[PDB]
Design a protein around this ligand. Structure first.
Ligand SMILES: [Zn+2]
Length: 87
């Protein structure tokens, strides 16, 4: 537990061992960004400290980029909270 994320009551942990990464709510990805909202599903993901997501929810394939701490290409999505379902 060396870093928080948006995911309500998440079990993330920025440890030297745990290869978990963290990202901040992006602006380059807007429409798709709506998807990120699902990543939260909370009252209203306030960009104050919640404007960020952890890898634990993202798909391994979404980490194709070997950047410093910015891995969430157009593909990026918090699948784990994929609300998109047969309404
Ligand atoms: Zn998380």
């Amino acid at each position: 537990m060396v870093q928080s994320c948006s995911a309500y009551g998440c079990k993330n942990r920025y440890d030297k061992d745990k290869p978990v990464s963290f990202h901040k709510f992006p602006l380059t990805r807007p429409s798709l960004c709506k998807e990120w909202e699902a990543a939260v599903r909370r009252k209203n993901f306030k960009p104050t400290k919640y404007s960020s997501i952890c890898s634990e929810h993202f798909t391994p394939d979404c980490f194709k980029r070997e950047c410093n701490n910015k891995l969430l290409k157009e593909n990026a999505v918090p699948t784990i909270f994929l609300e998109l379902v047969p309404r």
